Amino acid sequence: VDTCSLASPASVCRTKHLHLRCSVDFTRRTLTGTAALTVQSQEDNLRSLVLDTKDLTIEKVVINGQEVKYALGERQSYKGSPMEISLPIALSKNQEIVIEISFETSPKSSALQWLTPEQTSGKEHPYLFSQCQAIHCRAILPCQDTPSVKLTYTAEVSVPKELVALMSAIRDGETPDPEDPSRKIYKFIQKVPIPCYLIALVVGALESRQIGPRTLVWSEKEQVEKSAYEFSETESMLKIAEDLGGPYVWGQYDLLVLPPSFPYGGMENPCLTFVTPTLLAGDKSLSNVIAHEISHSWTGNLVTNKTWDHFWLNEGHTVYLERHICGRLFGEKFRHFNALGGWGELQNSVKTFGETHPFTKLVVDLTDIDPDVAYSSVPYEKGFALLFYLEQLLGGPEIFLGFLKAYVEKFSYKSITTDDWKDFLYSYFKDKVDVLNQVDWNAWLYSPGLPPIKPNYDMTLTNACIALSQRWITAKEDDLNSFNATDLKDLSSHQLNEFLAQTLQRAPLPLGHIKRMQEVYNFNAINNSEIRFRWLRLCIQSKWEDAIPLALKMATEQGRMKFTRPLFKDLAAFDKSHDQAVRTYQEHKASMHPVTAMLVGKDLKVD
Ligand SMILES: Nc1nc(-c2ccc(Cc3ccccc3)cc2)co1
Ligand SMILES: [Yb+3]
Ligand SMILES: [Yb+3]
Ligand SMILES: [Yb+3]
Ligand SMILES: [Yb+3]
Numbered sequence: 213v214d215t216c217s218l219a220s221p222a223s224v225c226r227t228k229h230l231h232l233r234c235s236v237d238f239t240r241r242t243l244t245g246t247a248a249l250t251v252q253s254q255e256d257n258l259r260s261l262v263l264d265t266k267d268l269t270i271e272k273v274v275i276n277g278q279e280v281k282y283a284l285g286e287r288q289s290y291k292g293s294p295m296e297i298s299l300p301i302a303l304s305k306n307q308e309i310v311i312e313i314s315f316e317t318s319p320k321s322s323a324l325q326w327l328t329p330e331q332t333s334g335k336e337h338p339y340l341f342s343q344c345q346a347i348h349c350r351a352i353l354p355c356q357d358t359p360s361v362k363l364t365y366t367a368e369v370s371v372p373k374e375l376v377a378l379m380s381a382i383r384d385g386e387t388p389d390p391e392d393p394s395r396k397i398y399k400f401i402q403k404v405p406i407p408c409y410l411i412a413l414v415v416g417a418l419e420s421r422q423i424g425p426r427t428l429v430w431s432e433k434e435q436v437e438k439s440a441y442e443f444s445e446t447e448s449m450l451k452i453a454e455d456l457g458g459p460y461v462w463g464q465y466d467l468l469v470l471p472p473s474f475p476y477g478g479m480e481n482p483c484l485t486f487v488t489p490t491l492l493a494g495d496k497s498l499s500n501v502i503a504h505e506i507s508h509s510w511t512g513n514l515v516t517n518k519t520w521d522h523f524w525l526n527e528g529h530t531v532y533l534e535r536h537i538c539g540r541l542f543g544e545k546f547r548h549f550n551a552l553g554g555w556g557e558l559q560n561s562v563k564t565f566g567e568t569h570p571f572t573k574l575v576v577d578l579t580d581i582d583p584d585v586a587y588s589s590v591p592y593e594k595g596f597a598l599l600f601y602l603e604q605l606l607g608g609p610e611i612f613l614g615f616l617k618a619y620v621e622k623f624s625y626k627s628i629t630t631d632d633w634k635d636f637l638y639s640y641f642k643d644k645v646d647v648l649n650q651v652d653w654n655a656w657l658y659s660p661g662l663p664p665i666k667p668n669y670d671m672t673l674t675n676a677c678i679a680l681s682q683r684w685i686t687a688k689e690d691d692l693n694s695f696n697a698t699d700l701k702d703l704s705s706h707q708l709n710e711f712l713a714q715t716l717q718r719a720p721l722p723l724g725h726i727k728r729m730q731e732v733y734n735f736n737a738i739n740n741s742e743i744r745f746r747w748l749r750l751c752i753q754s755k756w757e758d759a760i761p762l763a764l765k766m767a768t769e770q771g772r773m774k775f776t777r778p779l780f781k782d783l784a785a786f787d788k789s790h791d792q793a794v795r796t797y798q799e800h801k802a803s804m805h806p807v808t809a810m811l812v813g814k815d816l817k818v819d
Contacts, residue, residue: 213519214358214359214360214518214519214520215519215521215577215578215579215580216291216346216347216357216358216519216520216578216583217264217291217347217356217357217358218262218264218285218288218291218292218293218294219261219262219263219264219294219355219356219357219358220261220262220263220356221358221360222254222356222358222360222361223254223255224253224254224255224258224261225251225252225253225254225255225258225261225356226251226252226254226356226361226363227249227250227251227355227356227361227363227408228250228251228252228308228363228364229249229250229363229364229365229366230247230248230249230250230353230355230363230364230365230366230367230408230411231246231247231248231250231365231366231367232245232246232247232248232353232365232366232367232368232369233245233246233248233367233368234246234367234368234369234370235369235370235371235395236340236369236370236371236372236377236415238326238338238340238372240319241319241324241326242316242317242318242319243316243317243321243324243352243413244315244316244317245314245315245316245353246312246313246314246315247312247313247315247353247354247355248310248311248312248313249263249310249311249313249354249355250308250309250310250363251308251309251310251311252306252307252308253303253304253305253306253307253308254305254306255305256304256305257302257303257304258299258302258303258307259298259299259302259303260296260297260298260299261296261297261299262294262295262296262297263294263295263297263313263350263354263355263356264291264292264294264295264347264349264350264354264355264356264357264358265284265292265293265294265295265315265350265354266291266292266293266321266322266348266350266351267292267317267318267320267321267322267351268293268315268316268317268318268350268351268353268354269315269316269317269318270282270284270295270313270314270315270354271314271315271316272313272314273297273311273312273313273314274311274312274313274314275299275300275309275310275311275312276300276301276309278300280297280298280299280300281297281298282295282296282297282298283295283296289582290347290582290583290584291347292350292351295354297311313353313354315353315354317351317352318351320806321348321351321352321806322348322351322806322807322810323342323343323344323348323349323351323352324340324341324342324351324352324806325340325341325343325473325805325806326338326339326340327339327340327416327471327473328803331471331473331803332416332417332432332471333431333432333433333434333435333471334417334432334433334434336417337374337375337416337417338416339414339415339416339417339471340413340414340415340416341412341413341414341415341416341470341471341474341486342411342412342413342414343412343474343475343476343479343486343805343807344408344409344410344411344412345409345410345479346409346520346523346583346584347409347520347583348409348807349408349409349411352411352413355408356408357408357409358407358408358519359407359408359409359516359517359518359519359520359627360407360518360519360627361407361408361627362405362406362407362516362625362627363405363406363408364402364403364404364405364406365381365400365401365402365406365411366381366384366399366400366401366402367379367381367399367400368397368398368399368400369397369398369399369400369413369415370389370391370392370395370396370397371395371396371398371415372394372395372396373388373389373393373394373395373396374417375396375415375416375417375418376398376415376416376417376418377398377413377414377415378398378413378414378418378430378466378468378484379400379402379411379412379413379414379481379483379484380402380406380410380411380412380481380482380483380484381400381401381402381482381483381484382400382401382402382403382463382464382483383398383399383400384399384400384401385398385399386398386399402482402483404461404462404482404625405625406482406513407516407627410480410481410482410513411481412479412481412484412486414430414468414470414486416432417432417433418430418431418432418468419431419432419433419436420436420466421436421437421439421440423440423443423444423446423447423467424446424447424450424465425447426447426450426460426463426464426465427443427446427447427450427464427465427466427467428464428466428467429443429466429467429468429469430466430467430468430469430484431468431469431489432471435469435489435492438492438494439467439469439492441494441496442491442492442493442494442496442498442499443467443487443491443496443499443502444496445496445499445502445541446465446467446502446506448541449499449502449503449506449537449541450465450506452536452537452540452541453503453506453507453509453510453533453537456510456533456536456537456613456616456617457507457509457510457511457533457616457617457620458510458617458620458621460509461509461514461624462482462483462509462513463483464483464484465483465485465506465509466483466484466485467484467485467487467502468484468485468486468487469487469488469489469491469492470486470487470488470489471489472488472489472490472769472770472771472772473770473771473804473805473808474486474487474488474489474771474772474805475771475772475773475805475807475808476488476772476773476774477490477491477501477504477772477774478501478502478504478505479505480505480508480509480512480513480530482509482513485502485505485506487501487502487505488501488770488772489770490741490770490772490775491741493705493739493740493741494739495705495740497704497705497706497740498740498741498742499538500534500535500538500550503533503534503537503538504530504531504534506534506537507529507530507531507533507534507537508526508530510533510620511525511526511529511530511532511533511616511620512526512527512529512530514620514623514624514625515529515619515620515623515624515626515628516626516627516628517627517628517629518627518628518629518632519629520576520578520583521575521576521577521578522575522628522629522630523576523591524574524575524590524591524594524595524630525595525628525630525633526591527591527592527595528574528591528592528594528595528596528598528599529595529599529616529619531554531592531593531595531596532595532596532599532600532616533616535547535550535551535554535596536609536613538550544670545670545672545673546673546706548669548670548671548672548673549670549672549673549674549706549710550706551596551600551667551669552669552670552671552674553674553710553713554589554592554593554596554597555593555597555666555667555669556710556713556714556717557589557592557593557713558589558590558593558594558597558662559662559717560589560717561588561589561590561593562590562661562662565588565590567660567661567662568660568661569660570660571586571588571590572590572594572660572661573590573657573658573659573660574590574591574594574595574598574630574656574657574658575630575657575658576591584807584810584811585811585814594663597663597666597667598656598663599612600667601651601656601663601665601667602637602651604667604668605647605648605650605651606641606644606647606648607644615637615640615641618636618640619633619636619637619640622636623636630657634653652664652665673706673707674710676702676703676707676711677703677707677710677711677714678714680699680703680711681711681714681715681718683695684715684721684725684729685715685718685721687725689724692724692725692728695728695729695732695733696732697732697733697734699732699733700733705740705743708738708743709740709742709743709746712735712743712746712747712750713746715750716746716749716750716753719749719750719753719754720753720754720755721750721754722754723754723755723756725754726750726751726754726756727756735747736762741766741770741772741775744766745766745774745775745778745779748762748763748766748779748782749763749778749779749782751763752779752782752783752786752789753782753785753786755786755788757788757789760783760786760788760789760792763779763782763783763789764779764783764789764792764793764796766779767779767780767783767793767796768796768800771804771805771808773807773808773811776808776812777808777811777812777815780793780797780812780815780816781815781816783796784815784816793816794816794818797812797813797816797818798818801813
């Protein structure tokens, strides 16, 4: 049972296919159309079924060419409203029918952000993009909005002819709209079954550049050249990922660089990974996010979590593969450096939530929890830490990678639970069951807080970061003169970020130390978003009033939640910036992504 879905479960009926025909109306901020669901009964004498919806207007439901009865239930908060459909003829087990639902979305759809021309790079055209994970697909179309059900899909999308539509699917042509010569229809096919959280749409003034044999980058024209360079390692990462995971089954691997309000670093929409433009550091240094989205083509998109309580299966295995791709490209010492950084992010999340908090468990219970409120680094890093621990326990990365490949092959096209994973781990490692039974499974999977054992990490690349951080933390006023730009000369961007992260873990530092850091290191000049984020948090938490306009600008000029939520929270916690933080939120809230708007409002206690 999926506690986040109000739809008929997969034991009752299963959507096999969606045919979406829709029109994007930027004047009304609506998507209007038909969703034709091919549904297979899983029981005898099926006479009704229930779909998820959220803020959808339903015009009619058509089966066998006639309108049928349907009823929308009372709204259940973030879950939306269940839609019960009375079938005209009882179905036997395995019988399939087509249900055609005529619907329109709400301008406030939590799946969608509608941008005005002034919010875009080009300033002439508007822009739309979706983000369905976890349970926002129901705010675009009626569906069994659960990852326990996988379907293929086809779509035809009518847009103003000056604009381009793309989806999480193979492009299947474009024509003038035969109903309206001011519009174009773009067609799409997704022939690999997916959970519906992977459906995605973008409409805007998009251009493409080829960067590899199976990859185009898409953005507004102003970002194409920088994006092509930034993501040039993509084909190399795809080849490594195929070596680790088995064949790439999805045909194309395109990248779409969204406007700056995209809420996440990336989203693994099949055939078309969506990425934040905050990756555009100019030196490819944030390419781990691409390695992570590539990895999801296996762990998440092929093997899927059955319910959101088991989300760690998706993210932990993806971080694990991501860090192997980066280790194959840049060395094993680098993989251990990134692994140890992730432990630090886990320490931070556990300290923030508290060590007894239920969202620090690996397997969570999202009954009556908004999944967007539970989202954190925990499933990423506690999930990675478990796999990295098991790697060490079971004989190292070569051996554990054999398990990963076999796991993907076993559960390809399926939706699974933690128990399914664990049973297969035990089956695969049958000759090492004595080692597996040493694991404290109850603590790792079901207990809050830090895991009960910390893995072993190579320290080679970390040591200079720790040493410099400790020099600053232990410095007194009379030591500040000893710091110099030469301190950084042998540090990569990754090490500078880790130096900041280590130092931020001990924040605040005295204001004179932070002033001295700017004087000698000129961190205000650095445009790398991860470095800048941690530098600005360090400054604000250390009560540097000069950093307030910089922090407010970064919090509002982009909307990646990783950056925006903690910058707003730091600014609200500094008495000198509190009022500006709340005022700035209130002035921007109407033109924010709807999920970001909600979560920053929760964080700032501003309703
Ligand atoms: N260990 C652990 N898992 C979670 C968790 C589970 C599911 C989700 C849903 C979600 C929401 C938004 C975007 C992507 C996924 C979030 C967190 C927490 O702790
Ligand atoms: Yb029957
Ligand atoms: Yb075709
Ligand atoms: Yb039409
Ligand atoms: Yb078993």
